[PDB]
Enzyme design. Structure first.
Site, PDB file in Angstrom:
ATOM      1  N   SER A 239      -3.016   0.274   0.095  1.00  0.00           N
ATOM      2  CA  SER A 239      -2.419  -0.506   1.170  1.00  0.00           C
ATOM      3  C   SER A 239      -2.909  -1.955   1.142  1.00  0.00           C
ATOM      4  O   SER A 239      -3.982  -2.268   0.622  1.00  0.00           O
ATOM      5  CB  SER A 239      -2.737   0.126   2.526  1.00  0.00           C
ATOM      6  OG  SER A 239      -4.109  -0.025   2.843  1.00  0.00           O
TER       7      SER A 239
ATOM      8  N   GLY B 215      -9.071  -1.874   5.201  1.00  0.00           N
ATOM      9  CA  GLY B 215     -10.273  -2.493   4.666  1.00  0.00           C
ATOM     10  C   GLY B 215     -10.550  -2.074   3.233  1.00  0.00           C
ATOM     11  O   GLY B 215     -10.958  -2.892   2.408  1.00  0.00           O
TER      12      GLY B 215
ATOM     13  N   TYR C 260       3.873   9.525   8.187  1.00  0.00           N
ATOM     14  CA  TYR C 260       3.441   9.211   6.828  1.00  0.00           C
ATOM     15  C   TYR C 260       3.990  10.227   5.840  1.00  0.00           C
ATOM     16  O   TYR C 260       4.338   9.882   4.705  1.00  0.00           O
ATOM     17  CB  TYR C 260       1.913   9.180   6.749  1.00  0.00           C
ATOM     18  CG  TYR C 260       1.255   7.979   7.392  1.00  0.00           C
ATOM     19  CD1 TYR C 260       1.781   6.702   7.244  1.00  0.00           C
ATOM     20  CD2 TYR C 260       0.093   8.129   8.132  1.00  0.00           C
ATOM     21  CE1 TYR C 260       1.163   5.608   7.831  1.00  0.00           C
ATOM     22  CE2 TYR C 260      -0.526   7.048   8.716  1.00  0.00           C
ATOM     23  CZ  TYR C 260       0.010   5.792   8.566  1.00  0.00           C
ATOM     24  OH  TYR C 260      -0.624   4.725   9.156  1.00  0.00           O
TER      25      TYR C 260
ATOM     26  N   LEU D  51       9.362   1.640 -19.653  1.00  0.00           N
ATOM     27  CA  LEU D  51       9.064   0.739 -18.541  1.00  0.00           C
ATOM     28  C   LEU D  51       8.579  -0.625 -19.018  1.00  0.00           C
ATOM     29  O   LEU D  51       8.752  -1.622 -18.306  1.00  0.00           O
ATOM     30  CB  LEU D  51       8.027   1.374 -17.610  1.00  0.00           C
ATOM     31  CG  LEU D  51       7.569   0.525 -16.419  1.00  0.00           C
ATOM     32  CD1 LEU D  51       8.745   0.124 -15.532  1.00  0.00           C
ATOM     33  CD2 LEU D  51       6.502   1.248 -15.608  1.00  0.00           C
TER      34      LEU D  51
ATOM     35  N   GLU E 172       9.782  -2.231 -21.623  1.00  0.00           N
ATOM     36  CA  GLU E 172      10.984  -3.011 -21.906  1.00  0.00           C
ATOM     37  C   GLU E 172      11.576  -3.585 -20.622  1.00  0.00           C
ATOM     38  O   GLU E 172      12.121  -4.696 -20.623  1.00  0.00           O
ATOM     39  CB  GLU E 172      12.002  -2.138 -22.636  1.00  0.00           C
ATOM     40  CG  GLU E 172      12.784  -2.856 -23.716  1.00  0.00           C
ATOM     41  CD  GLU E 172      13.542  -1.894 -24.607  1.00  0.00           C
ATOM     42  OE1 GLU E 172      14.699  -1.555 -24.275  1.00  0.00           O
ATOM     43  OE2 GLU E 172      12.971  -1.470 -25.634  1.00  0.00           O
TER      44      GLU E 172
HETATM   45  N1  GTP Z   1       3.199   4.480   3.611  1.00  0.00           N
HETATM   46  C1  GTP Z   1       1.966   4.758   4.052  1.00  0.00           C
HETATM   47  N2  GTP Z   1       1.249   3.811   4.650  1.00  0.00           N
HETATM   48  C2  GTP Z   1       0.032   4.262   5.032  1.00  0.00           C
HETATM   49  C3  GTP Z   1      -0.500   5.520   4.873  1.00  0.00           C
HETATM   50  N3  GTP Z   1      -1.782   5.578   5.401  1.00  0.00           N
HETATM   51  C4  GTP Z   1      -1.994   4.372   5.863  1.00  0.00           C
HETATM   52  N4  GTP Z   1      -0.934   3.526   5.670  1.00  0.00           N
HETATM   53  C5  GTP Z   1      -0.848   2.127   6.063  1.00  0.00           C
HETATM   54  O1  GTP Z   1      -1.952   1.449   5.512  1.00  0.00           O
HETATM   55  C6  GTP Z   1      -2.512   0.530   6.482  1.00  0.00           C
HETATM   56  C7  GTP Z   1      -3.910   0.978   6.823  1.00  0.00           C
HETATM   57  O2  GTP Z   1      -4.693   1.049   5.610  1.00  0.00           O
HETATM   58  P1  GTP Z   1      -5.369   2.433   5.183  1.00  0.00           P
HETATM   59  O3  GTP Z   1      -4.947   2.783   3.800  1.00  0.00           O
HETATM   60  O4  GTP Z   1      -5.171   3.439   6.261  1.00  0.00           O
HETATM   61  O5  GTP Z   1      -6.907   2.005   5.164  1.00  0.00           O
HETATM   62  P2  GTP Z   1      -8.102   2.221   4.126  1.00  0.00           P
HETATM   63  O6  GTP Z   1      -7.698   1.667   2.813  1.00  0.00           O
HETATM   64  O7  GTP Z   1      -8.564   3.631   4.225  1.00  0.00           O
HETATM   65  O8  GTP Z   1      -9.217   1.262   4.753  1.00  0.00           O
HETATM   66  P3  GTP Z   1     -10.446   1.511   5.755  1.00  0.00           P
HETATM   67  O9  GTP Z   1     -10.168   2.823   6.422  1.00  0.00           O
HETATM   68  O10 GTP Z   1     -10.443   0.358   6.704  1.00  0.00           O
HETATM   69  O11 GTP Z   1     -11.672   1.549   4.899  1.00  0.00           O
HETATM   70  C8  GTP Z   1      -1.511   0.508   7.642  1.00  0.00           C
HETATM   71  O12 GTP Z   1      -0.521  -0.492   7.446  1.00  0.00           O
HETATM   72  C9  GTP Z   1      -0.909   1.910   7.570  1.00  0.00           C
HETATM   73  O13 GTP Z   1       0.372   1.983   8.153  1.00  0.00           O
HETATM   74  C10 GTP Z   1       0.266   6.522   4.233  1.00  0.00           C
HETATM   75  O14 GTP Z   1      -0.046   7.696   4.003  1.00  0.00           O
HETATM   76  N5  GTP Z   1       1.516   6.037   3.851  1.00  0.00           N
HETATM   77 MG    MG Z   2      13.390  -0.667 -30.027  1.00  0.00          MG
END
Ligand code: GTP
Ligand code: MG
Ligand code: VLB
Ligand code: POU
Ligand code: EP
Ligand code: GDP
Ligand code: CA
Ligand code: MG
Lengths: 440, 429
Positions: A140, A144, A224, A252, A254
């Site tokens: 994401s 963080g 999610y 991919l 290409e």
């Molecule tokens: N599409 C999708 N977005 C997700 C999912 N889980 C979290 N997000 C999005 O990711 C963002 C939050 O980041 P996360 O990935 O939850 O956080 P992290 O990387 O674990 O970071 P920290 O918990 O702060 O250490 C938000 O915008 C959420 O909507 C998921 O399973 N699918």
């Molecule tokens: Mg070729």
């Protein structure tokens, strides 16, 4: 040969990786314990799926993947889920304390305590390859860990593997599912830090996906689980070139040649069709013409923007399933005329087209209807800059008052890193402006 | 006498294999290299292209090169794949990614010496080597970038042998990859300076023939390549079969190339007739001759009526009276003499060979050196500069160590080449 190593980082990266690897197993006929009754070569083999699976002497097909997160609860679900027997315990790495939605904690305070261990597990996977092609990094923008730790990892990978190619699958924040008020900060910081370490990044806008699920699948309040299952279909389409082989299948790499005209301009816009429920598809056979047409509807884009208001530098169509060249030719001929597709004047050939004959598959109990043919379009359009504009505006509003900045500064960051990141974004928006201008 | 043959990259190995397939059938060689022919006419000159191994086994004097194994297995597992010498497979694993710089300077650099070793081993097995022939495309990475690197190295070890290439030009009608005009332009630059004779086989022309003339709605490379093998057999007839011509590659160059840089030939083949009600008609020499000269039969997408022929070689195969052929060829020139420059007297030559190609009672093969070939280089040049104007996709090549100047002087050379053709199109006596 041509192996690919997948790295799933943070909650979103981990949960999307879970969706992807379940889909891969269904596509190749790999069972949840790693057995693949279809595979005759035991212990090894140079088959197409081997780009993503290694084999053990006992016949287990093991994802070439690393899951890493700074806290355990998400990966713990992998350790105990349906596919728990698919991974070796060392491919799942967890910390005790997460980044608290704070880039600075992910890149520095916490990340620095697990980076060496992660790079080590990766080396172990790379050592099992005969011709390592590169990395796919799932994360994401807003978390963080998704932002800060992913940046650290990418900088480290450049140092340890040089020019070896790194492709990103990134979740762009949307207020309908956003977990933190500071996600625009983390988004600009990671995009700045990663721009020169990534060869090609596929952005998925959570709001775009959210809307498609609501409108096309009839899910009133998507989760999610709904989002990831749809995302995984896009991911499967892009990697299908590497996992299968066909006479009309095109690799991919290409596509990458056509998709990246300049290093910094490496953000293709993805679409996918058909996205339809079992109920609606029961009485509706969707033709190559219909699904091709859907790729040019603004509302079907995986990032909210309007390509009619931009210029194309490339369109790559990745067809799969029951598709023959004659139907594709007619479909594109129609689109060229009935549509206003404007290419830059410096791109002679705008369309690249391939067919993967492997039919699309769906997870039982999912929301997608099982269809005979599908298409994924990757295009490079200046319109994608609208997504940068929207992020940069949210950044500027908060940063003008230094709101929340003390959290990053308290962790060791300087304000200069903020304005440096923001100025880089300003150049990126300008770069998208200049490629679109007609030639003298 | 002896010719050493090299095929490089996917396209080069594809058409190179069909070539050996076709001429092996003509000379009565079966896929295991045993001779099963009737006439001995098929062994008179068999040593031109084949080495004689112990046990009455003829093995092609062919070297197979590629930067990836895929096509190696493909050829090796196909019809006539067992006929090739197993030492003469030289391949890598990295691939060239349709990148001329990878084929010519970075990845190909490591494999090139292995190829020169096999080249050297075959040349020393020759009684009197007359020269080399290369099949490759210009639009990819290996055949274009590494094929031209091979030409340059081979010329430096055999500076006085004849160097001849069958070169496939790229077309947007056939191929998707945006950087092909880049690869072709860099390649044309190398070809004007280091080959003696180049057959321009244009995928744009091959496509129009299959789609318009032959009515093939879903053309495959197999269709295109079967046109190429037919033409390659035709243009090499007078090397592989005796009769009325005491000719080799050098004599052909001397009489076909009046100016060093103007050595790019326009090929053509007759008959070409769509399926199938006309596929049973008997061909007359008058019809063969009109088809041969028809602009829509040309195998480089350029209108010969727009320019002039400097030199023409035509070869007929099958049972037919030479009197008819003579009269017909003279008719074409006397009745359309403005399409042949008048400062080269008697500049269209004919050869007739008794043995016809498989499946045909008669056939004709056309080799034209015409000022109109400039249209081919103009087409590629337009695609090149449209991109190069903005340095688009340049990073794929500068990341391999190339400079912009190298592109500028390649486009420069091709523009001059265009100019040179234009100046003899208006030159008069
Ligand atoms: N599409 C999708 N977005 C997700 C999912 N889980 C979290 N997000 C999005 O990711 C963002 C939050 O980041 P996360 O990935 O939850 O956080 P992290 O990387 O674990 O970071 P920290 O918990 O702060 O250490 C938000 O915008 C959420 O909507 C998921 O399973 N699918
Ligand atoms: Mg070729
Ligand atoms: C001879 C080798 C070849 O088979 C020749 C064509 C292309 N490829 C592979 C096969 C192929 C074809 N079409 C495909 C569609 C999807 C997947 C594969 C194909 C092929 C065909 O229809 O017969 C088999 C074909 C392809 C094209 C093709 C014709 C064609 O067969 C007739 N066109 C010449 C171009 C094309 O760009 C064009 O200029 O319009 C005619 C064309 O555009 C349209 C609107 O048709 C099109 C069709 C997909 C569009 C975008 C990409 N360009 C590349 C070349 C072009 C194609 C045939 C290689
Ligand atoms: C030979 C010089 C240079 C151009 C010329 C002048 C050549 C001459 C002769 O070439 C075979 C044509 C010949 O005399 C014919 C008129 C009988 C004939 O065969 O013409 C072609 C049409 C062809 O279209 C391309 C024509 O425009 C063309 O190529 O003309 C079919 C048909 O048309 C009525 C007719 O049966 C090509 O090398
Ligand atoms: C036109 C032909 C023969 C012919 C003309 S008049 C007659 C009695 N026979 C030959 C031409 C051969 O040089 C070879 C190239 C042809 C390509 C074909 C294999 C093509 O792909 C295919 C669609 C065909 O045209 C046929 C299979 C029908 C082929 O037999 C006729 C043909 O073109 O071959
Ligand atoms: N006529 C013909 N052209 C081909 C064939 N295969 C590839 N090409 C063309 O060759 C170019 C790509 O070069 P290729 O040989 O694939 O790449 P290489 O392996 O790096 O040399 C494109 O213009 C293709 O259309 C083939 O079998 N026949
Ligand atoms: Ca196996
Ligand atoms: Mg987390």
């Amino acid at each position: 040969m041509r192996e690919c190593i997948s790295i799933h980082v943070g909650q979103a990266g981990v949960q999307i990786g879970n969706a992807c690897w379940e889909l891969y197993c269904l596509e190749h006929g790999i069972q949840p314990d790693g057995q693949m009754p279809s595979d005759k070569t035991i212990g090894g083999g140079d088959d197409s799926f081997n780009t993503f699976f290694s084999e053990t002497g006992a016949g287990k097909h093991v994802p070439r993947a690393v899951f890493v997160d700074l806290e355990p609860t998400v990966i713990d679900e992998v350790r105990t889920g349906t596919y728990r027997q698919l991974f070796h315990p060392e491919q799942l790495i967890t910390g005790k304390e997460d980044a608290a939605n704070n880039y600075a904690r992910g890149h520095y305070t916490i990340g620095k305590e697990i980076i060496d261990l992660v790079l080590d597990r990766i080396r172990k996977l790379a050592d099992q390859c005969t011709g390592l092609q590169g990395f796919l990094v799932f994360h994401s923008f807003g978390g963080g860990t998704g932002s800060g730790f992913t940046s650290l990892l990418m900088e480290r990978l450049s140092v340890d593997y040089g020019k070896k190619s790194k492709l990103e699958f990134s979740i762009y924040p949307a207020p309908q599912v956003s977990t933190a008020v500071v996600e625009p900060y983390n988004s600009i910081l990671t995009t700045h830090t990663t721009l020169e370490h990534s060869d090609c990044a596929f952005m998925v806008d959570n709001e775009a996906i959210y809307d498609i699920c609501r409108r096309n699948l009839d899910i009133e309040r998507p989760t999610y689980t709904n989002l990831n299952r749809l995302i995984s279909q896009i991911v499967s389409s892009i990697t299908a070139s590497l996992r299968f082989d066909g006479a009309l299948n095109v690799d991919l790499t290409e596509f990458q040649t056509n998709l990246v005209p300049y290093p910094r301009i490496h953000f293709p816009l993805a679409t996918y069709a058909p996205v339809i429920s079992a109920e609606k598809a029961y009485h509706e056979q969707l033709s190559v013409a219909e699904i091709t047409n859907a790729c040019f509807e603004p509302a079907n884009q995986m990032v909210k923007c309007d390509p009619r208001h931009g210029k194309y530098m490339a369109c790559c169509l990745l067809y799969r399933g029951d598709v023959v060249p004659k139907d594709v030719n007619a479909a594109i001929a129609t689109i060229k005329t009935k549509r206003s597709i404007q290419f830059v004047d410096w791109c002679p050939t705008g369309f690249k087209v391939g067919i993967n004959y492997q039919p699309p598959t769906v997870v039982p109990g999912g929301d997608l209807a099982k269809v005979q043919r599908a298409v994924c379009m990757l295009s490079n359009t200046t319109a994608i800059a609208e997504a940068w504009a929207r992020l940069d505006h949210k950044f500027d509003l908060m940063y003008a008052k230094r709101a929340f900045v003390h959290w990053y500064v308290g962790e060791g960051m300087e304000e200069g890193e903020f304005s440096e990141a923001r100025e880089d974004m300003a150049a990126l928006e300008k770069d998208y402006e200049e490629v679109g201008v007609d030639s003298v | 006498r002896e010719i050493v043959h090299i095929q490089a990259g996917q396209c080069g190995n594809q058409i190179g294999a069909k070539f050996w397939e076709v001429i092996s059938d003509e000379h009565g060689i079966d896929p295991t290299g045993s001779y099963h022919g009737d006439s001995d006419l098929q062994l008179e000159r068999i040593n031109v292209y084949y080495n004689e191994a112990t046990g009455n086994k003829y093995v092609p004097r062919a070297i197979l090169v590629d930067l990836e194994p895929g096509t190696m297995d493909s050829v090796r597992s196909g019809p006539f794949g067992q006929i090739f010498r197993p030492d003469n497979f030289v391949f890598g694993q990295s691939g060239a990614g349709n990148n001329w710089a990878k084929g010519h300077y970075t990845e190909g650099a490591e494999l090139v010496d292995s190829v020169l070793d096999v080249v050297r081993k075959e040349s020393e097995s020759c009684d009197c080597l007359q020269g080399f022939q290369l099949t490759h495309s210009l639009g990819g990475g290996t055949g274009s970038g590494m094929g031209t690197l091979l030409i340059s190295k081979i010329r430096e070890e055999y500076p006085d042998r004849i160097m001849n290439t069958f070169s496939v030009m790229p077309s947007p009608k056939v191929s998707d990859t945006v950087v092909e005009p880049y690869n072709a332009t860099l390649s044309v630059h190398q070809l004007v300076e280091n080959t003696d004779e180049t057959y321009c086989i244009d995928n744009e022309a091959l496509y129009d023939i299959c789609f318009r003339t032959l009515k093939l709605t879903t053309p495959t490379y197999g269709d295109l390549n079967h046109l190429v093998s037919a033409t390659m057999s035709g243009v090499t007839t007078c090397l592989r079969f005796p009769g009325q011509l005491n000719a080799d590659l050098r004599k052909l160059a001397v009489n076909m190339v009046p100016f060093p840089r103007l050595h790019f030939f326009m090929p053509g083949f007759a008959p070409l007739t769509s399926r199938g009600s006309q596929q049973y008609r008997a061909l007359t020499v008058p019809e063969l001759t009109q088809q041969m000269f028809d602009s829509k039969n040309m195998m480089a997408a350029c209108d010969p009526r727009h320019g002039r022929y400097l030199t023409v070689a035509a070869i007929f195969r099958g049972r037919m009276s030479m009197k008819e052929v003579d009269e017909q060829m003279l008719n074409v020139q006397n009745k359309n003499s403005s399409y042949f420059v008048e400062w080269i007297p008697n500049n269209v030559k004919t050869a007739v060979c008794d043995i016809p190609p498989r499946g045909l009672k008669m056939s004709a093969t056309f080799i034209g050196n015409s000022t109109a070939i400039q249209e081919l280089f103009k087409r590629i040049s337009e695609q090149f500069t449209a991109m190069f104007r903005r340095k688009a996709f340049l990073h794929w090549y500068t990341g391999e160590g190339m400079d912009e100047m190298e592109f500028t002087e390649a486009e420069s050379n091709m523009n001059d080449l265009v100019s040179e053709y234009q100046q003899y199109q208006d030159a008069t006596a």
